[model samples]
Target: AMITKYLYDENAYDYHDGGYRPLKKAPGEEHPLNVPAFLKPDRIEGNEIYYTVTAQAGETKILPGKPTHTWGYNGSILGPAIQFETGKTYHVTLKNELDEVTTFHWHGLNIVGPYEDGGPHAPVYPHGERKITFTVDQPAANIWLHPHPCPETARQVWNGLAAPVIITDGHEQSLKLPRRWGVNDFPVVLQDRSYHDNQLDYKADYDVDGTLGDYALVNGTVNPVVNVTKPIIRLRFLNGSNRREWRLHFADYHPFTQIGSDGGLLPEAVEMDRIMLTCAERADVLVNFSDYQPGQEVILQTDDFNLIKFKIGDIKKENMLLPSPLAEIPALSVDENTPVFKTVMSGMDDQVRLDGKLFDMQRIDTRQQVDQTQIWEVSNTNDMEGGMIHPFHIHGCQFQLIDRNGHAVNPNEHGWKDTIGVNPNETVRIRVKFTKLGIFMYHCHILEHEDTGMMAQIEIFDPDHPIEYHLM
Candidate 1:
């Protein structure tokens, strides 16, 4: 049976709050959806790939008027799409051309933390560069890249410093799914921004709770539309927003299949009519347009606002039949003798706190043994009436959802996840294991909440070979 209801509580949604900024239709002609160009490697020798990613400032033609000032990796707006393969080593040179400090954070990559993870501790100063090397050892997923400097991440993202990172593995490649980028598979980055005379002023419209934009931008394009040439198209939806939770659905209530979540493909596909994504979360979905005749348009909407219009063409019709047992996920069991670590998310606006304290970059809040499986009970202290959903995210590793409020996890949440939305007055328990030894940050995914100190750090330690981390 298909799931028709949104898994989240309606009262806890962002729209119920007083400071919500309702998205309005962008005033411009419908432009083709912007698919960022794939970033070409500087060189590749056997299994080693080299790349040079620069964060530069420029202007982009977002609306009908003047260009909007923005910051991107290699372009004026969102950065190029980066593809990573499992078991391949990558050498990257991160450069900063902007006038301030920034950090290049691989949001969901399973790499070492505090330095290579590119958290607040690792900063690339103005006109400076930093080099790092790591191998991609995680499963296939739709991860992302963004700035993670403390207190400035929201502003940088608002000015546009986000990009899509696509991870591919041998198993995922063998599946009969959409794999062609910009042809059948595309990145749908959902973001919102309020422009001032066709320019961005992050300081002017800053919200302590979370900045809200009046216009919705899909893959950096305003009033975007996609020309449907293929019968089945895969959209990797990333909630690259500062604060908004997107409730996505088609206008005609069309049924779609959610094949993958944040970390990778689900063990089994889930048939759904609607899905919701919190900040920094991802959903890999497939929509079959064979039933729609030529000239018909399917409008994708978030709440009451139209996001993308899919115009149908003369594509051949065929039945959508996915293979059974999409992927295999190993079960994680928690040890009865080990204690569960409980982390609390409390407060709102300037008062947001993780474990009742703001983030301190040098302070290691917790410690756990590397390669040992443990359970973490993450909770939110806000009440359901006026509280909101805080997307809890952890760096360095992906985890498995054990349960939510003592009940079974949602049907689509059985796979690996690096981020999960915790509702008001709810506890989300997950099975976590750290494969790398380093200090990693775990906090709320709400950009402003994180910036305001709803963040903390954990040390994945190896007792046999103890190493000291210089926090300063």
Candidate 2:
């Protein structure tokens, strides 16, 4: 008794095979959504935070005079907005000048993996450079970072590697949110680009079942224009889309609240007015505009386009009151015979699989033991007809989203999560808890359905912490 439409969502993708369906609404070249400025860290020396992250090979300008051709990590188009400090440590160096191998993957960082958890078994080649370190144990989220080379991670995050990973925890600096970065706090990098003649050609908009990009980026911006001014603005979203899925809202229906998710802050706020994420999800949302009028703009929309057109300017109201216990949900009990495990994310395009076979990388596909508390049950293979919507990721660890088919979950899914969303015939029951010990990866954040395989891998078996991996 639960399905909720979405059988080929967004691009309505019945645009199969030679896919290139464009009957209008596919024109982009206007940039001005510019509001960026959140690349913090170049040196901090005390709690470490020395970031270097270069992956280069660039050109950007999105469209218009046509440049595109990107890779980024230390800047080329996207990369640089680390901002950590919750126990601190990030010494990151990881450079690689494109031309080949990559793997700095930290999507939702909880650390430790098939080597620093940068997956695809951690490669770096092409003009390589290493130096890694990790810390910021967890709390205060918005995690990201990409280029998990394996079948070249969806063509290297569809040609732009990706970035944005704020972590900070001091209970989020004693909460009241809105940290004021680009002026009312905002990172918003929810992309969906596609330009062939205009060039960005990821093998010319390839689509096995996951590339839908007619143009709509908020941080790689296309038709963006945000210019807020307090009265509670804060927006942080990052679904750095490699496969579209953002149902956001606010065009008047405006009602926001949602204070932090995808790994941090959230025990209170959640007065949504419609918001959905899907690919690599992470949200913050807080909008208030004080009552409006000051040039009043406020657009935001997502399924209907018009991504952030705020422009409210000149404000100063602060009745301040949002934090009512944000952070501390982590308990996830575990021990009721436990044994859930299941997987099944059934095919849609290239017959993506997780429990049917595709990604093997030597194979490990689930093992649990280092601090066990499992209960997976992921499921997606929908069919009332078609089916789509599958976020699901998991690495290192942090689960506890326990319910979807049993109902009850989102309030920002309570906190500790690695990535979720499993609709369509649904299942979504989490509770995992590895806590770092070794080879970790759990897939389908849709980066080309995890580069043609739908991904898998889980090991954590710490018999006192045995470690030894070097796969290729």
Candidate 3:
């Protein structure tokens, strides 16, 4: 039996006004890039916070033996992580000092209006700063921020313009979960990269559909090692790669406790040794390393891949244990009182777009009623032969995966999820209730197809409350 290689075709660009050729960067040359990480919080107040996110261009060393070259962002690889408190209004200032134009899009955050939503329609001029003020009305969840450059959103993100944004609420704070940031608690972003002539390469290696590199980087470091004492360590894992699903597992068969998902906390703790994370998805879990003796070497591996090595030392057993019930997640009902919206996803080539038309930021594809609970049935009509799974994600709201192909997904999926992988030749039913009124985006997680118009916009209106929309 011969295995088929999944190669992205750049020539199949019919839906786009003009087909785009694969981006070709010079061999052995590194483009200025930076990996996004935690952005230090400047100040915090009661129900109000302020943050400054700076996007700067710089260079760093990817390979030990390789020379340093140009990269984008504030730090080396990814930018800084932005932390926010739920129910608090955040006045965020995005400063773009890079040579090129860039805008910050808060993925998975429910903003007040479209202009502040950070979509492609709202472009912050170069060397200019945009002040976006919005109240964080959603539950505690793992959100993200990245550049939303029109027609180049995929490339910009793939080239490294993404960072982690954590939302904490009263419900989550009340739980006895790990609250330490960057110490016992950490953010692990899984990504792959290819090297050509000993230099970090992106364009030549992967094109529109995004490329999967063999080299894996955790928190922007290859084969990283962290020191941990005997106790429970919290890891917030984000699959930030363009096109790779990480099947994470520990090498020593230590069962990890899952506390939260994309949207918020699970109803209860789920103990499992292996977990699957698709692109743009997040999982918050606690790994108890108390079993390992001091000075023991324990490796945190995933899918037979060594992600993080832990040197167990200074055993100090504490009484800190994960609480029983994590947080309260309000379930959305699919009764007759709630409306139903069906989104059919059918496309063979790159040009085949949503609803028989290409994605136009200027046009509103769907209009949703405010505070109306609706069941969204997303179906993929591909022939069941060799179709690949499409990782679907929505903006402004979190949803629950009701069922897949008439069967419920894994019990772990019952919690809140912002992105769900719809298996090929299947339909994924989800119930979503939008509280914030604005224009948001919904599209495939595959960055390549998204760039070629596998996206649509929707307007959420609250009839009871007065709202506004920014015209393009």
Candidate 4:
């Protein structure tokens, strides 16, 4: 059965804020959606790949007049989409060409933390470089890469420093899904921002409760349109917004198939008409245009704002049904004997707190044994009447949602996830297990809230091989 309505509370959306920025239509003709090119690797060995990624400042023509000054991994705006194969070791040289310090954070990758995880502890100073290597070990998923420099993360991301990272495994590759990039498959990087004189002024538009933007952008393009010719198109969506949660649906009430979530492919495909994504979340969906003709168009929208227009072209209709049993997702076993960890997210805006206090760089708030399965009870203390949703995220590992308020989780949340939206006055239980030993962060994914110290850290150790990390 298909889910027709969005599962989240409509009243808790960002649109209720007094300072909410309603997106306005861009002042320009509909242009092609910016499909970022794939980042070319420097060298490819038998079981390893080498690449170079540079963070630099430049200008992009986002409007009619002067170019908008921006920062990106390689281009002027969003960086190129990089691909990783499961089991292949990657040696990446991260270069900082910008004028300030930044850290390269692979948002959804399951790697060791504090350093390779690229949290606040790993700082790549201006004009300097850093090299790191990690083998791709997780299942196929749509993830991202962005700057994670402490309080400056929100500012740098506002200046356009984010990109898509596609991970492919043998099972996912064998599926009958859209495989060609820039064609049937595309990365829809959703974001919103306000420009001053065709340039970004982060401070001028800053808000303690996640800065709201007046205009919407899809892959950094204004008023973008995708020329669709295929019968089916796969869209990998990444909500790169600071805090806005997207209630996504089609203009004509079209239904789409959701195949994957934050961590990877779901065990089974789901058919739904509406879906929601909080900060730093992702969804892999397939839209079928078989019912429409060449002159028709479908506008993808969030609430009342038109985000992207899909202009239907000469279509080649084919029977391309979604594959069943997408992947084998074994549940993480937890029983009455398992230990539990509780964390709370309270207040809002400038008063947000991860527990009862703000984040401290030198403090390790909690510790857990590595490779032990445990249940984490993450709660948002705000009441439902006037509170907002907080997207809770953790680094180093992905978890499975056990329940919400002792009830079943959302139908689309059956797969692995590294982040989940906690509704106000709700407590979400998740089964978490970390395989690596290191320090990692767990906090609200809102860039502003995180910058305001609504965050904390935890240490995963084996006890036998105890190692002390030099805290920042």
TM-score of candidate 1 relative to the true fold: 0.99
| Candidate 3 lDDT (Cα, 0 to 1) | 0.71
Residue 358 local lDDT, model 4: 96
Write the residue-wise lDDT of candidate 2 on 108-195 in tens digits. 7788778777788778898988877988677778887887877778878767778887877766777747786777787788877777
State TM-scores per candidate: 0.99, 0.33, 0.87, 0.99
The 0-to-1 C-alpha lDDT of every candidate, in the order given, reads 0.93, 0.74, 0.71, 0.90
Writing each residue's lDDT as its tens digit, candidate 1 over 78-164 gives 899999999999999999999999999999999998889999999999999999999998889999999999989999999999999
Where does candidate 1 stray beyond 4 Å? none
Worst 10 residues of 2 by lDDT: 1-10
Better of 1 and 4 by lDDT: 1
Clashes of 3: 22
In what order do the candidates fall by lDDT, top score first?
1, 4, 2, 3
TM-score of 4: 0.99
Best candidate per lDDT, number? 1
lDDT for 134 (candidate 3): 88
lDDT of candidate 4 over 174-290, digit per residue (tens): 886887787789999999999888889989999999987888888999998888879799999999999888889998779999999999999999999889999999999998888
